[PDB]
Amino acid sequence: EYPTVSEIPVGEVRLYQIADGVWSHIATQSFDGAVYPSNGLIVRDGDELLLIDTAWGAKNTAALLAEIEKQIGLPVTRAVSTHFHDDRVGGVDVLRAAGVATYASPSTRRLAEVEGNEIPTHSLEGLSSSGDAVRFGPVELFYPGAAHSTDNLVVYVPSASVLYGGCAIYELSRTSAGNVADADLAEWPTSIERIQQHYPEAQFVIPGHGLPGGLDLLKHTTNVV
């Protein structure tokens, strides 16, 4: 039922209900010769929607807003990028032009400026040190320390016990490290434990790529790194 990579043509976006007020958006994009699926989060925020990450590109993100408009019908007013890679910030310009206020930690914003990626407009205070947490509307943002990247944040929806781990967290079927050029391998396992120790009542854990799982996904990631 969860959409797979061969089912989403590059340019299209699917929405998947995870609990109500919480959806994940799935898009596809090529990366060094191959196409991969990628997840993001959507959270109902009163009469508005909070977006967690872009759909990996300008055209995909445009498709995302259109799909949101078609299936949910509420405006996306804010977005948070969980790290500096293009599958997280690629498309913030389309979001900006659509009236969406974009956010990211200052760490993410400068890591994106130096790599030449799109840069979220606003800086998120209170997450510069491992273990820091801040609330942001219907969700709580957490900076566990360097893992997939040195700036990676994870997101938690209290009212739904949904833990969005981003690309610091791997799906279950993934048994190899893959690309970790921007990671801190030595610290990764420690950052994940910080996540474990911080959201032990998580019911759903969404990886940055692939199928949903449980807290089950954390140790699996450590074991793969």
Ligand SMILES: O=C(O)[C@@H](CS)CCCc1ccccc1
């Ligand atoms: O820039 C990067 O290093 C990554 C963005 S998270 C590319 C992700 C592509 C991919 C996603 C999941 C598994 C293997 C490859």
Ligand SMILES: [Zn+2]
């Ligand atoms: Zn990444």
Ligand SMILES: [Zn+2]
């Ligand atoms: Zn990723």
